[PDB]
Amino acid sequence: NIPTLPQNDPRPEQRAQQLDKARETYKYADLLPPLAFCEGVPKPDTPSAAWLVTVGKVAAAVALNAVANRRAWKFDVGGTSEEDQNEAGHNSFLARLENPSVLDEVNERVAAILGAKPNRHVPPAQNVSKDGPNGRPQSMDDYANLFRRITLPPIASTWKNDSAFAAYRVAGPNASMIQRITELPDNFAVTDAHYKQAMGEGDSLDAAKAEGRLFLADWKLIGETLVNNTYKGAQKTVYAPLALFAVPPGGGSLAPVAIQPGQTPSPTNKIYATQDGNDWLAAKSAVQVAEGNYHELVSHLGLTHLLLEPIVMATYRQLAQHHPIYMLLIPHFEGTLSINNSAATNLIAPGGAVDLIFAGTIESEHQLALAALKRHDFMRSGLPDTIEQRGVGDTSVLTDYPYRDDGLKIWANIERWVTAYVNNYYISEANVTQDTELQAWAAVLSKPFAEGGVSGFGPIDTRAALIFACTKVIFTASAEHSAVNFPQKDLMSYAPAITGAGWTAAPPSQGPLKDFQPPLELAELQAEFLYLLGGVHHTKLGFYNSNSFPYRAWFKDPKITAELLPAFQRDLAASEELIVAANATRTFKYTYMIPSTIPMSINI
Amino acid sequence: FLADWKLIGETLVNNTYKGAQKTVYAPLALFAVPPGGGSLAPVAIQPGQTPSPTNKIYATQDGND
């Protein structure tokens, strides 16, 4: 079959009766208010067994790490050891049928890990558990020794370097943060002395601002929304820092200069420079906790999961199955409704892993996410658009920026494919205005943010506008999601490197570095839920398949199946070679824009 | 072969003749001779002792500078 715009369909009334039944399947609920959320997970959008089987293995290693950590701390833990092996035995052969344990344990185990819930031991086998790691640490080795059956991430042996602290602002969880400045802000009056400590006596602050070599990262949003909370009495802290960066003359890698932990200068809030020893390291470790809340809530669970939640709904409800755009986006939404449901009811839920490990009150964290969703401009949020918004565009100044460099080739691949897909189906700008389904699609996403609309979405009255709204949507369900979901495992699962809470009010150092760090009960949990979220690479951008057992090709129109989509897939494999060419010549590898790794959808 | 006028910087104070700023630097000039020997020939000049944004190294292909 060949897709058809609604004003071209040979069988119109049947199409409208499919849409009347889809709107009965996809109804709105306020699972998280001010937002357009789905009422549970409709049966079609259940996770596929392939997803469950893939997730079950990672979650099985997570439970074993808990049991193996329970062996070290202080026959029971040998019994729970083989039962978790038994579920892996079920997944390897019982689920090998593909044609019981899948929807049971896998979904159940994800909830206990994401919900921070205790007794993550064995499904159907039924203070803090002082038979597992808990409380304040004896030594810094205890954090590295929580990684028994899961492998310790590499950043643990490198996070203290200043070169790695800058690698997070170009190749870390939130690599969209820095913005080029021509002057300094008034709340960050750094001196030429601090600049020379970071750059040498051969460079000048006033020259870096001239040659466009300054880059500021401002967490002002963190101070406007977050309210600290006490875990089992103990206070957790988060700041609203400003951290300057620069590049050496002639263009090179990024490097830190100064850190001001707060927004306003004061005696209790002074600039810390690169030569200040343990106070400097604290300032970075403080800045990293700000990134932990900002990335998790604004960049990852804010500007991907919940930004696409209304776009997923409007597509199922205004676009028909025989509509070609529904044929383009629905596979890029595979499982999005399910993971945002397990997110809202477990993760960002009271008593969840975000409630404990992160410094804010759980309801102040929601205000943080909703604040960025409200300030977005969907029409002006393309990657090449933001790159010149932030002045980070010059590749001869800021030469090492893997997110920008690797990410723009993937964006160019998506828009090339979205263009030929739109231009093959829309042969005139009148095809856009007469697409009554697309205008209902556009009119509902164009509602103000209070109603449930995507902020700044309008107007989609042009073939060009449809191309962008489809490129952005595909990019933020695939590349942009990989660039923020998988750094969780590789860069965020080790708490001293970065975590959600500071456990001393320490931009000024006050003693041991083991007192700033989270309790071992949470540090084991932070690792276990960030290893599970960032360690599942299921479905692959460029290959449109189904979510049912055959997993047979989704596209049916021959022009796509044998001509257009094959060209798009080659465009990725060509970009994959050039990106590995860059990754070989890079010390800090960036594997999140590699096509063979990028997922089609937001599914974890 | 290096010619370094460091002593100029550690002693002299720039004055003014009828208001106009007379200036003098403490340069460093690098010279080399071709392989097998020959006459001296300039390679580069750094007009100031301490390198800085204002004090750069100038080469033979830099035209009027």
Q: To which H or E segment does residue A430 belong? A: helix A430-433
Bridge-based pairing state of the strands A272-273 and A255-260: antiparallel
d(CA A214, CA A167): 16
Whether chain A has a CB inside 8 Å of the CB on B57: the answer is no
Chain A residues closer than 8 Å to B50 by CB: 201
Report the SS3 class of residue A64.
helix
Lookup result for tokens 């199409």: A15
d(CA A281, CA A502): 13
> What residue of A is the nearest CA neighbor of B55?
A202
Lookup result for tokens 């709107």: A23
d(CA B51, CA A362): 53
* Technique that determined the structure: X-ray
d(CA A159, CA A168): 10
Across the interface, whether the CB atoms of B51 and A204 are under 8 A apart is answered no
Tokens of A50: 């392939």
Mutation target to probe the A interface, by most A beta carbons within 10 A, among B46, B49, B50, B52 is B52
d(CA A463, CA A423): 8
Chain B residues closer than 8 Å to A206 by CB: 53
Lookup result for tokens 């329970």: A70
Backbone angles phi, psi at A430, to 5 degrees: -75, -30
Please, where are the H alpha helices in A73-211? 76-89, 107-114, 141-144, 162-171, 192-199, 205-210
> Residue type at A143?
Y
Sequence-ordered list of residues with C-beta below 8 angstroms from that of A207, at least 6 positions apart, any chain: A213, A249, B53
Across the interface, whether the CB atoms of A203 and B53 are under 8 A apart is answered yes
> Minimal CA–CA distance to A395: which of A409, A379, A416, A377?
A409
Across the interface, whether the CB atoms of A204 and B50 are under 8 A apart is answered no
Backbone angles phi, psi at A540, to 5 degrees: -135, 125
d(CA A470, CA A419): 9
Tokens of A5: 């715009």
d(CA B11, CA A582): 52
Tokens of A79: 């019994």
Neighbours of A48 (CB within 10 A): 23
Sequence-ordered list of residues with C-beta below 8 angstroms from that of A410, at least 6 positions apart, any chain: A475, A479, A572, A575, A593, A595, A598
- Look up residue A269 and give its DSSP letter: B
**Residues A453 and A364 sit within 8 Å (Cβ to Cβ):** no
Chain B residues closer than 8 Å to A196 by CB: none
Distances (CA, A) of A2 to A60, A326, A467, A506, A560: 43, 13, 20, 62, 10
Please give the resolution of this entry in Å, rounded to 1 decimal: 2.8
Whether chain A has a CB inside 8 Å of the CB on B51: the answer is yes
d(CA A88, CA A209): 57
Across the interface, whether the CB atoms of B50 and A201 are under 8 A apart is answered yes
Sequence-ordered list of residues with C-beta below 8 angstroms from that of A378, at least 6 positions apart, any chain: A307, A454, A455, A456, A457, A469, A472
Distances (CA, A) of A404 to A176, A378, A382: 9, 19, 12
> What residue of B is the nearest CA neighbor of A208?
B53
Tokens of A525: 């949990």
Whether chain B has a CB inside 8 Å of the CB on A183: the answer is no
Whether chain A has a CB inside 8 Å of the CB on B52: the answer is yes
Distance of residue A190 Cα from the nearest chain B Cα, in angstroms: 19
Whether chain A has a CB inside 8 Å of the CB on B21: the answer is no
> Minimal CA–CA distance to A473: which of A320, A598, A299, A303?
A303
Q: Tell me how many degrees the CA angle B22-B26-B28 measures, rounded to the nearest 5.
A: 135
E strands, A40-116, in order: none
Distance of residue B54 Cα from the nearest chain A Cα, in angstroms: 9
Chain B residues closer than 8 Å to A204 by CB: 52-53
d(CA A316, CA A297): 26
Distances (CA, A) of A467 to A251, A328, A404, A415, A475: 35, 11, 21, 7, 12
**Residues A106 and A55 sit within 8 Å (Cβ to Cβ):** yes
**Residues A355 and A362 sit within 8 Å (Cβ to Cβ):** yes
> What residue of A is the nearest CA neighbor of B51?
A202
Report the SS3 class of residue B21.
strand
B30 beta partners: B2, B44
